[PDB]
Amino acid sequence: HMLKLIVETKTLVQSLGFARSVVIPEYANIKLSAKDGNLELSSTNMDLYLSQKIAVQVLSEGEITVSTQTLSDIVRKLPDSELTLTELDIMKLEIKGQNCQFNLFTLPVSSFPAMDSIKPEVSFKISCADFAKIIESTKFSISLDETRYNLNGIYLHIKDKEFFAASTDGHRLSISWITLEEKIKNFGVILPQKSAEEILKIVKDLKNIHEDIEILLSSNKIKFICNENTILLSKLIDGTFPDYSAFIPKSSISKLVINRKIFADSIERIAIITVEKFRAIKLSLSRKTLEISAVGEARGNAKEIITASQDKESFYEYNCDESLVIGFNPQYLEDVLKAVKSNLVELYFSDISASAPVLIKFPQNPKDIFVIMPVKV
Amino acid sequence: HMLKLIVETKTLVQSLGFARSVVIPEYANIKLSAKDGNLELSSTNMDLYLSQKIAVQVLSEGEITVSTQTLSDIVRKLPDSELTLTELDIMKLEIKGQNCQFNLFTLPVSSFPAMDSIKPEVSFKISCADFAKIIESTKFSISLDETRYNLNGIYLHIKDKEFFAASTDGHRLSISWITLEEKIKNFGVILPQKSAEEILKIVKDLKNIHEDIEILLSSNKIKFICNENTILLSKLIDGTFPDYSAFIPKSSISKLVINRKIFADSIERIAIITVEKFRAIKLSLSRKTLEISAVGEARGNAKEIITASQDKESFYEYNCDESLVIGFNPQYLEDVLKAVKSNLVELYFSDISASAPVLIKFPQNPKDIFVIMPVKV
Ligand SMILES: [Cl-]
Ligand SMILES: [Cl-]
């Protein structure tokens, strides 16, 4: 029972790309299992276990483990449209193209870890495109200092018939959600950042983006089954996620509506002049104009004017007689503006003060909510 | 007398790119001098002095110095096709687009160094495209350990009516030359690697690549005048360059001729399996086939076969009844194969031994010569 199979090179390349992004000496290896018409590729690290199955021509069933880096480095440089992989009885894997041959040392399959299991408290199916959106809307506002453990992940939780992703670092809040088909018990987990990054890449793949992903949750792990053939098992962050609806404002006295792109682009160039000790831009809002300005000590200052317009390509509107001057960290604003593809963006102000948290919404994207603490300017 | 000018943004962006690649606190600044229809931009470090002149609308003549990083970071994010630059009397430079304004702190022009001078022993003019070729054929085989000082540059020297570039690291030798229009005294200098990198970028620019570069040499510096308006003054490496014709072989018993691309691509994938402690590939040459193989300890082995062919796209020929087995560092081979755009490449073997230096030539490129020491395999 020795592995032998013919695989489409481009397909193997793509699978190895996911294996590389996942990665103890055993973590440097990938397990290849040829069985029942498929090649199963297994990769694991301290927090993730990834299993991918791809259709191949299974000529002989078997399993080997080999260096992930070595195998992917070779395969992505082979010009052949198909490759033959053969386990030989010298603890070696032969990779054969039309004119070239590579013999890789293999490692004992018995030293490769098998995947653990889950006893889910809840499980449900959502579309890959919906899951990609909620992760893309929350991955950027995860906290990054390792002291606040319960903030270094994305809170995934079911409330009523809705599935939320939420992230915060104490300075901003990001929430994105999906309506579930059936009712389902309320439950929540904190997904580690690396795990979120990996599953996002998997669902965004062109083979998966139009299909569905099953999600299984328990108190100690989460399991993703993406379009049947890709399984990712992840540890969780062991913490309580704060009840974040405490930091969402319930009212507003005024709102800015502005073309998203011109806003993002203006913030970016005005923030160039700032320094790290004072990363802030100032918005001076009026009915007629928006002024975006910043200062940087021993560097200079900058200002851009955006005038009122009802044209979609240059839209700016602020329907309030009272002008408002308010500051923000430009990176936090840019993070939100880049998370959602939308023509317009809306900023809601709780009061006529430069201290209240600001709520950000994109029209034609009602299921995303962002809150940013302002800074004194 | 305060600077004020209108400049095409894209032109300023390109000039600042060269200024950035050049870069003591004074080295962080760029001098802008508006005079007689041009903006002159000066940048300097410990070894280079760069002066660029670009046509602008000089509205008022003057000079300022400002942070290179800050100015380029701002200008490359401005969408305006033209910008106005105005020195104001608060030691500040205003950069104005249509809707935005940046005020940069300036530094005293009197603290910016002026360029030194040259009293050339020889001077001559060659085309930018010819100079680019000889630098591209020699920059990769400069030595990189700082002990052998006289090898960490490109030897530029006039012999008879020919102008040579030559570089070596003790393992390989690269020589490329140009025929000069007039006779000129024999003279040579060692151009530092960074200086070679910078002038190569300048001559390769689309505005300069079809024009000429004047070269002025003295015992202690070299001056380039590229297409009239860009001047680069460089220090030299103070050493004697070895008479390298000692390491060129004068005869050959056999030669391989092979399609350059298939050779480079095969070497690259076969070398994947090697390790750093033994970076070598093996060529087994025969009339009928070329076998390219390698081994990597605790990794595996690899082999590719190239068969005899007279077709240009897959050319392989070796007109010798005696087979030859010879090894090389694959990076040294790849360096040469990537330096010259040519369909075929030729390897000349001094004798039927795996120890003699190998001479490499590209047909339709007679003015390039490369020699590589083989390695035992
Ligand atoms: Cl079988
Ligand atoms: Cl004037």
UniProtKB/Swiss-Prot annotation, chains A, B:
SMART domains tied to this protein: POL3Bc (SM00480)
Protein's UniProt keywords contain DNA damage: no
Q: Which InterPro entries match?
A: DNA_clamp_sf, DNA_polIII_beta, DNA_polIII_beta_C, DNA_polIII_beta_cen, DNA_polIII_beta_N
UniProt keyword Nucleotidyltransferase present = yes
Q: Which UniProt keywords apply?
A: Cytoplasm, DNA replication, DNA-binding, DNA-directed DNA polymerase, Nucleotidyltransferase, Transferase
Entry's Gene Ontology BP terms: DNA strand elongation involved in DNA replication
- Give GO terms: molecular function aspect only: 3'-5' exonuclease activity; DNA binding; DNA-directed DNA polymerase activity
Cell compartment(s), UniProt: Cytoplasm
List cellular component terms (GO).
cytoplasm; DNA polymerase III complex
Kindly give the NCBIfam families that the UniProt entry links to this protein: dnan (TIGR00663)
Briefly, what is this protein's role?
Confers DNA tethering and processivity to DNA polymerases and other proteins. Acts as a clamp, forming a ring around DNA (a reaction catalyzed by the clamp-loading complex) which diffuses in an ATP-independent manner freely and bidirectionally along dsDNA. Initially characterized for its ability to contact the catalytic subunit of DNA polymerase III (Pol III), a complex, multichain enzyme responsible for most of the replicative synthesis in bacteria; Pol III exhibits 3'-5' exonuclease proofreading activity.
Q: Which family does it belong to?
A: Belongs to the beta sliding clamp family.
What quaternary structure, including any partners, is listed in this protein's UniProt entry?
Forms a ring-shaped head-to-tail homodimer around DNA which binds and tethers DNA polymerases and other proteins to the DNA. The DNA replisome complex has a single clamp-loading complex (3 tau and 1 each of delta, delta', psi and chi subunits) which binds 3 Pol III cores (1 core on the leading strand and 2 on the lagging strand) each with a beta sliding clamp dimer. Additional proteins in the replisome are other copies of gamma, psi and chi, Ssb, DNA helicase and RNA primase.
The protein's name in its UniProt record: Beta sliding clamp
